Swiss-Prot record, chains A, E:
Species whose genome carries this gene: Homo sapiens
Domain notes: The rodlike tail sequence is highly repetitive, showing cycles of a 28-residue repeat pattern composed of 4 heptapeptides, characteristic for alpha-helical coiled coils.
Localization annotation: Cytoplasm, Cytoskeleton; Cytoplasm, Cell cortex; Cytoplasmic vesicle, Secretory vesicle, Cortical granule; Cell membrane
Basic and acidic residues: bias regions: 6-26
Region entry Disordered, spans: 6-28
Family designation: Belongs to the TRAFAC class myosin-kinesin ATPase superfamily. Myosin family.
Highest taxon listed in the record's lineage: Eukaryota
Subunit and interaction comment: Myosin is a hexameric protein that consists of 2 heavy chain subunits (MHC), 2 alkali light chain subunits (MLC) and 2 regulatory light chain subunits (MLC-2). Interacts with RASIP1. Interacts with DDR1. Interacts with PDLIM2. Interacts with SVIL. Interacts with HTRA3. Interacts with Myo7a. Interacts with CFAP95. Interacts with LIMCH1; independently of the integration of MYH9 into the myosin complex. Interacts with RAB3A. Interacts with ZBED4. Interacts with S100A4; this interaction increases cell motility. (Microbial infection) Interacts with herpes simplex virus 1/HHV-1 envelope glycoprotein B.
Lineage: Eukaryota, Metazoa, Chordata, Craniata, Vertebrata
Function: Cellular myosin that appears to play a role in cytokinesis, cell shape, and specialized functions such as secretion and capping. Required for cortical actin clearance prior to oocyte exocytosis. Promotes cell motility in conjunction with S100A4. During cell spreading, plays an important role in cytoskeleton reorganization, focal contact formation (in the margins but not the central part of spreading cells), and lamellipodial retraction; this function is mechanically antagonized by MYH10. (Microbial infection) Acts as a receptor for herpes simplex virus 1/HHV-1 envelope glycoprotein B.
Name this protein carries in UniProt: Myosin-9
Primary gene name: MYH9
PTM field: ISGylated. Ubiquitination.
Disease: Macrothrombocytopenia and granulocyte inclusions with or without nephritis or sensorineural hearing loss: An autosomal dominant disorder characterized by thrombocytopenia, giant platelets and Dohle body-like inclusions in peripheral blood leukocytes with variable ultrastructural appearance. Some affected individuals lack leukocyte inclusion bodies on classic staining of peripheral blood smears. Alport syndrome-like features of nephritis, hearing loss, and eye abnormalities are present in some patients. Deafness, autosomal dominant, 17: A form of deafness characterized by progressive high frequency hearing impairment and cochleosaccular degeneration.
Tissues where this protein is expressed: In the kidney, expressed in the glomeruli. Also expressed in leukocytes.
From Swiss-Prot, chains C, F:
Compartmental location: Cytoplasm, Cytoskeleton; Cytoplasm, Cell cortex; Cytoplasmic vesicle, Secretory vesicle, Cortical granule; Cell membrane
Highest taxon above the source species: Eukaryota
Sequence positions bearing N6-acetyllysine: K29, K38
Protein name as it appears in the record: Myosin-9
Quaternary context: Myosin is a hexameric protein that consists of 2 heavy chain subunits (MHC), 2 alkali light chain subunits (MLC) and 2 regulatory light chain subunits (MLC-2). Interacts with RASIP1. Interacts with DDR1. Interacts with PDLIM2. Interacts with SVIL. Interacts with HTRA3. Interacts with Myo7a. Interacts with CFAP95. Interacts with LIMCH1; independently of the integration of MYH9 into the myosin complex. Interacts with RAB3A. Interacts with ZBED4. Interacts with S100A4; this interaction increases cell motility. (Microbial infection) Interacts with herpes simplex virus 1/HHV-1 envelope glycoprotein B.
UniProt comment concerning the protein's domains: The rodlike tail sequence is highly repetitive, showing cycles of a 28-residue repeat pattern composed of 4 heptapeptides, characteristic for alpha-helical coiled coils.
Clinical disorder: Macrothrombocytopenia and granulocyte inclusions with or without nephritis or sensorineural hearing loss: An autosomal dominant disorder characterized by thrombocytopenia, giant platelets and Dohle body-like inclusions in peripheral blood leukocytes with variable ultrastructural appearance. Some affected individuals lack leukocyte inclusion bodies on classic staining of peripheral blood smears. Alport syndrome-like features of nephritis, hearing loss, and eye abnormalities are present in some patients. Deafness, autosomal dominant, 17: A form of deafness characterized by progressive high frequency hearing impairment and cochleosaccular degeneration.
Family designation: Belongs to the TRAFAC class myosin-kinesin ATPase superfamily. Myosin family.
Role of this protein: Cellular myosin that appears to play a role in cytokinesis, cell shape, and specialized functions such as secretion and capping. Required for cortical actin clearance prior to oocyte exocytosis. Promotes cell motility in conjunction with S100A4. During cell spreading, plays an important role in cytoskeleton reorganization, focal contact formation (in the margins but not the central part of spreading cells), and lamellipodial retraction; this function is mechanically antagonized by MYH10.
Post-translational modification: ISGylated.
Tissue: In the kidney, expressed in the glomeruli. Also expressed in leukocytes.
């Protein structure tokens, strides 16, 4: 019974980390796509310039 | 030059649209691949019991 | 306290990142403002002379 | 005309190669999606057991 | 006995999530900072244009 | 883990002072140089006209 209560404590800490990890995963993947778009825009401006 | 340049716009713009969808599909595959292990890990935990 | 400390540390990283990001834009702006002013005025001075 | 005729030969080949790569990547994504949905359903069913 | 591994498994999830979050956090900082310098470089091409 | 968060945050605190000093010097340098170069150039062009 005490182990079940203590076991739930780790679940709360994992939930707080999952929200931060999930947010970083989606943001990290979105940041990678922005680099490709920014690189393509630089080529269009550099070629025209 | 104008006719040849116009033909490149339909191919250049078309290729960019396909590349954009490929990047989004590739990003979703990495997220699903990493998330796939999460479901298996959680499933293995419940299945272990 | 650890979760609260991470919030302050995470917030400091965002603020620190903003300063680093602004520094890159500031150097680019100063480098471009000097050329746009030294070039637009140098050519105009030659025409008046 | 010389630079436009050379870029067309390279852009036409890039579209074909990228199209085939997207099809192969989409095939593995569909299989992973089915496994992900099965894991969630099996995970909930395992909890009842 | 399962609680010993179950409780320890939950603690391992926090370490695993923290390791992935710490790695993504450090990688996101370098990736996010690179986007600032990349976007700032576009200002040079636009300003120089 | 708490010591690492405080240690990493403390290490970045010293770097924030250097970034803040550079931001004030960069903003004041671009504003003073722009207002001075543009003022002296506008006055010279007005006299020539």
């Amino acid at each position: 019974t005490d182990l079940e209560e203590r076991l739930r404590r780790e679940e709360k800490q994992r939930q707080e980390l999952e929200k931060t990890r999930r947010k970083l995963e989606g943001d990290s993947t979105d940041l990678s796509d922005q680099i490709a778009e920014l690189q393509a825009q630089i080529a269009e401006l550099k070629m025209q310039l | 030059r104008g006719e040849l340049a116009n033909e490149v716009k339909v191919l250049l713009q078309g290729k960019g649209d396909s590349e954009h969808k490929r990047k989004k599909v590739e990003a979703q595959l990495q997220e699903l691949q990493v998330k796939f292990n999460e479901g298996e890990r959680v499933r293995t935990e419940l299945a272990d019991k | 306290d650890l979760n609260l400390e991470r919030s302050h540390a995470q917030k400091n990283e965002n603020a620190r990142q903003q300063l680093e990001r602004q520094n890159k834009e500031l150097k680019v702006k100063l480098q471009e403002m000097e050329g746009t002013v030294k070039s637009k005025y140098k050519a105009s001075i030659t025409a008046l002379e």
